[PDB]
Amino acid sequence: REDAELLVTVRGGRLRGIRLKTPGGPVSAFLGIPFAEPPMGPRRFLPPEPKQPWSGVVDATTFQSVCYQYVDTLYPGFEGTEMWNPNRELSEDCLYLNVWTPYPRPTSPTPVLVWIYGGGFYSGASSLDVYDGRFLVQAERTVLVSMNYRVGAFGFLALPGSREAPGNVGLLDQRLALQWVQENVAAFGGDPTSVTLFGESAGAASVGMHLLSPPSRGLFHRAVLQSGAPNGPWATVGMGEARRRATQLAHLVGCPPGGNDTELVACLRTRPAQVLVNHEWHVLPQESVFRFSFVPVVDGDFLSDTPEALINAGDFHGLQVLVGVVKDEGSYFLVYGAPGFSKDNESLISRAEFLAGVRVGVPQVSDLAAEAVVLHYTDWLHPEDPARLREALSDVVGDHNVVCPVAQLAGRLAAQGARVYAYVFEHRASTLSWPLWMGVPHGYEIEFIFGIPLDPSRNYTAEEKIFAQRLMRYWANFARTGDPNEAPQWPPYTAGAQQYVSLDLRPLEVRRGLRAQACAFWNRFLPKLLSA
Amino acid sequence: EDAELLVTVRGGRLRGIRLKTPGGPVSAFLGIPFAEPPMGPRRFLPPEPKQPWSGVVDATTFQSVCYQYVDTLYPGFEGTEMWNPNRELSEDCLYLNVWTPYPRPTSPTPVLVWIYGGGFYSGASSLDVYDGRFLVQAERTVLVSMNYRVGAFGFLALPGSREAPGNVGLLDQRLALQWVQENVAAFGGDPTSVTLFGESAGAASVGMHLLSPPSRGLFHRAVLQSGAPNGPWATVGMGEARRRATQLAHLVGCPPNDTELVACLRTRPAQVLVNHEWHVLPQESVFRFSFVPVVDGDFLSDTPEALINAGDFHGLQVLVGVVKDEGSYFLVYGAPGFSKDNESLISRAEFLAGVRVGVPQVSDLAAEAVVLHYTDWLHPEDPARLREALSDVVGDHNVVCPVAQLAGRLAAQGARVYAYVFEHRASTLSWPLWMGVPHGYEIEFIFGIPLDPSRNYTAEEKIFAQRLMRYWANFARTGDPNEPQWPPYTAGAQQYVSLDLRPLEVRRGLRAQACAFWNRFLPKLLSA
Numbered sequence A: 001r002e003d004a005e006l007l008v009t010v011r012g013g014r015l016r017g018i019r020l021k022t023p024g025g026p027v028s029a030f031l032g033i034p035f036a037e038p039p040m041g042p043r044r045f046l047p048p049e050p051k052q053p054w055s056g057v058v059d060a061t062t063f064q065s066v067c068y069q070y071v072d073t074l075y076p077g078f079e080g081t082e083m084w085n086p087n088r089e090l091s092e093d094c095l096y097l098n099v100w101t102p103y104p105r106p107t108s109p110t111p112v113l114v115w116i117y118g119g120g121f122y123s124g125a126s127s128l129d130v131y132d133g134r135f136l137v138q139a140e141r142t143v144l145v146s147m148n149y150r151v152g153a154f155g156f157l158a159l160p161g162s163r164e165a166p167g168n169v170g171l172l173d174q175r176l177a178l179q180w181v182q183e184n185v186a187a188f189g190g191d192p193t194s195v196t197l198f199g200e201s202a203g204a205a206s207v208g209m210h211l212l213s214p215p216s217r218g219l220f221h222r223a224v225l226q227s228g229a230p231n232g233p234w235a236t237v238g239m240g241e242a243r244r245r246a247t248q249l250a251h252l253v254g255c256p257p258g259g260n261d262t263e264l265v266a267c268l269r270t271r272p273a274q275v276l277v278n279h280e281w282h283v284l285p286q287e288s289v290f291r292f293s294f295v296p297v298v299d300g301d302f303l304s305d306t307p308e309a310l311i312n313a314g315d316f317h318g319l320q321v322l323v324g325v326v327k328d329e330g331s332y333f334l335v336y337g338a339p340g341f342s343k344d345n346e347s348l349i350s351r352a353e354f355l356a357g358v359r360v361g362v363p364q365v366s367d368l369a370a371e372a373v374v375l376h377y378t379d380w381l382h383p384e385d386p387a388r389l390r391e392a393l394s395d396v397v398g399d400h401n402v403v404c405p406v407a408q409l410a411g412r413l414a415a416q417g418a419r420v421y422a423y424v425f426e427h428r429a430s431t432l433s434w435p436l437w438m439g440v441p442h443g444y445e446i447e448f449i450f451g452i453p454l455d456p457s458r459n460y461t462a463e464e465k466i467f468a469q470r471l472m473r474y475w476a477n478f479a480r481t482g483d484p485n486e487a488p489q490w491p492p493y494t495a496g497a498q499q500y501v502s503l504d505l506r507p508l509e510v511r512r513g514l515r516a517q518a519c520a521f522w523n524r525f526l527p528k529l530l531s532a
Numbered sequence B: 001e002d003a004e005l006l007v008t009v010r011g012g013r014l015r016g017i018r019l020k021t022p023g024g025p026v027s028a029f030l031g032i033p034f035a036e037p038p039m040g041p042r043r044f045l046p047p048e049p050k051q052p053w054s055g056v057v058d059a060t061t062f063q064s065v066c067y068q069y070v071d072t073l074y075p076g077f078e079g080t081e082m083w084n085p086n087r088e089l090s091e092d093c094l095y096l097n098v099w100t101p102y103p104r105p106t107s108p109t110p111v112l113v114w115i116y117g118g119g120f121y122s123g124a125s126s127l128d129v130y131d132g133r134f135l136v137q138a139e140r141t142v143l144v145s146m147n148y149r150v151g152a153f154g155f156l157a158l159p160g161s162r163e164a165p166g167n168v169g170l171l172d173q174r175l176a177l178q179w180v181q182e183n184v185a186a187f188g189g190d191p192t193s194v195t196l197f198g199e200s201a202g203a204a205s206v207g208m209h210l211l212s213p214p215s216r217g218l219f220h221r222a223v224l225q226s227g228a229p230n231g232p233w234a235t236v237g238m239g240e241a242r243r244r245a246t247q248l249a250h251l252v253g254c255p256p257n258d259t260e261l262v263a264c265l266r267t268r269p270a271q272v273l274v275n276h277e278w279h280v281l282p283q284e285s286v287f288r289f290s291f292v293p294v295v296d297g298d299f300l301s302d303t304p305e306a307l308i309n310a311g312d313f314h315g316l317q318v319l320v321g322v323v324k325d326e327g328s329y330f331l332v333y334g335a336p337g338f339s340k341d342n343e344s345l346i347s348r349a350e351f352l353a354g355v356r357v358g359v360p361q362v363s364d365l366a367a368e369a370v371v372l373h374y375t376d377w378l379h380p381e382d383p384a385r386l387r388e389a390l391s392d393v394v395g396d397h398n399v400v401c402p403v404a405q406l407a408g409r410l411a412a413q414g415a416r417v418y419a420y421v422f423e424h425r426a427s428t429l430s431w432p433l434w435m436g437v438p439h440g441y442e443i444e445f446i447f448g449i450p451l452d453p454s455r456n457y458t459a460e461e462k463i464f465a466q467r468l469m470r471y472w473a474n475f476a477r478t479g480d481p482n483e484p485q486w487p488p489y490t491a492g493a494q495q496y497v498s499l500d501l502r503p504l505e506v507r508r509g510l511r512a513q514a515c516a517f518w519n520r521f522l523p524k525l526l527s528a
């Protein structure tokens, strides 16, 4: 006595899933499918090995463990923090993926959406409530896949050139999952010839890196980059600085008691996973509000050059991408260490706090460059207005880290053969627990893309549910056709007209300029100065 | 004979002329010698006080114009010819002029001293737009103006040499100011109330007298119009001045010992030096200033910027301002694509080309920073926007931001500053409309030229001219232009007033965002 709809055979063996209820009807979920051998013991820091075939039926009936990661404790018990923290036990045995499909299974091959979570390459999990695929699959009849990938030291510690810790294995985790989709998604009714990757923040940077890595590029057809880009200043690190960071962590945990790499990694392997996590914060070169200790390394392998170079020199004919940002990208990060900031106050900073915030929000630039930032962002008719300083600091951090990297990628892709669509998400959710001064913070479009307002246990307003259904429709139209349009039209983004649309409760408004003036500073001038 | 027209000064007796204005007569003494003619062995040397004379000097007509290049870019065009010499060129040119009410005052009258502009290479006190008769009649002041040597004759420097020490044109101005102290009372002028006013290089001159202590005791108030001593074109270092002096010596067939070199230069006709003066500049530029004040530790003990930042300016009142479109006039003197006879709608390549020529000696890095700041990246190739942007580049770098930096430093360090922007386009203007209110075209209103019946200004423009004359003379009398009030300029509020036919409007910021680029960032970048 079984349900045939919940039984699927993949190349590795048989799976049994669970049937979820949604407001619109049932969907089939296969949660926690193993796609790699567990990377534990001698397998830690190594590239993932494909999951060996199994006999019997594996129950894919619940989310599996979260990969080991630092857990944020800035506002304990605060919904705005807790929603991003692991909702499963931490474990190095965490390489599992999730498939949601219509109930019953599609008769015709169905387009596939593949989600890559964010969290600065040091955190995140596919099991977070806000990444629940059931509403998207029910509303738009797609197949949705999400995977866990190793973060922090376990996914991106790199001793470049070494066999034992080559770096970027968290990206290879993603790639292995993408390879699993090509080989297996048709068993769930998905179309391996229509796969759209989507991600946010570090997930968006991951998506972009798969675009720029030929072995990944054959595994999908379309890409969505939400509030992140591979050319972001926090998303990559050079070979030498990666080695310095790996060596510093090893030194901090007593390894060895630099030297031979094989030996150093062997010492690192004897350390408890939690010990590495608790020391990862002490590795960074400068105090920062952003920077993350272990991120993808540009070592000539996964990425043959810097993403910026690969973007600038790329031929992108035959590609559709959808990119965008939230209205207030910088605000969320400032409450995480910038002087004068708190979610519990107005964070009306002084001029001196503004100056100190630029250094933390724009880490590792010269004084000369920091002076250029201050000049650019200061209103010299109101140089000391606290409210204006707070707003300017938010734009500094958001422009440098999210908006301008996105705009640069969008412009280069459009000019080099791809069709681009761009948005700014401008709705502040009625459920938002953050203060009003933060506006629409980083990450808070995700719940609308995934249709979370349709959850009966939540309290979104009726118009926000309509709004959520409109965005799910845009995303699914893009996955099926490469075009979010079906009514107000969404024009493509081009390097000249630079048109984008605003996403909020009102109909689409077409505007031009993704912070065009600001991003000319970050993308055209400051790069000149650096090499001088 | 008219007794009002005979004056004895320290050097002897003069005879002046009675002039007519629509408001009544005025006494004028034109072509008064204040120095020995700086000729032959005296060329390039500091001026010497005029030795006394017997008999009566005839002071009824303007004297010669000091030797200078004559602009030939639009021959016969009123816009260019109004600045060209209207008297014969001569090295025997150090004369000044005095206008007084008729009959001559018998109470000490405040004195205005005009220093003309012209990039330190040109200019004359005899130009029609500097006619002092209307200011003097309308506002009952004494007005003085002097000729000073320009070009090589006034500013060729072999620093350290006795023979060509540099800045002698500035010393010409100082001697005229010394002459005013010793003789102005004989005309009814008050030597304890002397206000200096100048435009462009004349304003830079005023600023340099403000920062040179031997000149500071010769006047009490200062007006700087479209110029500042910290302007990029206003000064030169000792090494570059020596290089320029040496290259002109080569160009006119003279040997590279300073004594030898200057002696050979002295044998060359004056016209010959003028004919080669442009060729000394290192790079091609819209500004032809080859010989300018030199920072040698003497007249200027430091750069004007260093002197400005360090000075105690309590007790000083100053009036500064700009025209609405400072850059447009300079663009037609060689910026690619520009002409008075077209709309000057330039390409982006021409805009970029024009930046290098309007900002003459900056690195590519700095130039790039300029084109980043002045590009609208939503309309990067719009010809009309590019034309206006390059006008802003040239005007901000050369006039507006040097003036704004001076005004802010002086206010923050004790001076009472009043700032204006002159926004009225003269109904008689011969330049095209796209130029707006160009550099130099506030002068005619402040000298009351619209009151001349033989000119075609409107009734409204004459009322306006009378307003400006009252502001300027109020400031000369009291250090305050007011009688809608004109508030002082401050480093914080940055308030200025708009001068046009409308009543005064108070605004904040002399291109504050643009000038933060020139006055705060770029200096940091150049050193690195």
Ligand SMILES: *[C@@H]1O[C@H](CO[C@@H]2O[C@@H](C)[C@@H](O)[C@@H](O)[C@@H]2O)[C@@H](O[C@@H]2O[C@H](CO)[C@@H](O)[C@H](O)[C@H]2NC(C)=O)[C@H](O)[C@H]1NC(C)=O
Binding pocket: A260, A261, A262, A263
């Ligand atoms: C760097 O060191 C590694 C490991 O050293 C070995 O580890 C010991 C436990 C034992 O295996 C010993 O042989 C060594 O001390 C080297 O890898 C070994 O290289 C030697 C041959 O030269 C030999 O042991 C095996 O080939 C390797 N054993 C492994 C992989 O554990 C490696 O060659 C050294 N590289 C250099 C030169 O820096």
Ligand SMILES: *[C@@H]1O[C@H](CO[C@@H]2O[C@@H](C)[C@@H](O)[C@@H](O)[C@@H]2O)[C@@H](O[C@@H]2O[C@H](CO)[C@@H](O)[C@H](O)[C@H]2NC(C)=O)[C@H](O)[C@H]1NC(C)=O
Binding pocket: A337, A338, A339, A340, A341, A342, A344, A345, A346, A347, A348
């Ligand atoms: C606004 O608040 C921030 C943060 O204060 C936090 O929230 C408060 C309600 C309270 O719980 C504090 O303990 C929290 O730190 C202020 O920034 C801090 O100010 C304190 C003052 O003693 C200082 O000791 C800390 O170092 C500051 N932390 C920083 C700069 O990150 C800020 O000063 C407040 N601004 C105002 C006046 O509104």
Ligand SMILES: *[C@@H]1O[C@H](CO[C@@H]2O[C@@H](C)[C@@H](O)[C@@H](O)[C@@H]2O)[C@@H](O[C@@H]2O[C@H](CO)[C@@H](O)[C@H](O)[C@H]2NC(C)=O)[C@H](O)[C@H]1NC(C)=O
Binding pocket: B334, B335, B336, B337, B338, B339, B341, B342, B343, B344, B345
């Ligand atoms: C607008 O006019 C400028 C300048 O043209 C000048 O005025 C004309 C009436 C005529 O007298 C020309 O000889 C003058 O040069 C133009 O710029 C020039 O364009 C010509 C080609 O037509 C070129 O050979 C010159 O080198 C250019 N000179 C400069 C200083 O750039 C400009 O092309 C005109 N633009 C228009 C009318 O759209």
Ligand SMILES: *[C@@H]1O[C@H](CO)[C@@H](O)[C@H](O)[C@H]1NC(C)=O
Binding pocket: A457, A458, A459
């Ligand atoms: C939604 O609001 C209701 C109001 O009673 C509350 O009981 C419930 O806990 C809320 N659930 C949320 C905020 O998810």
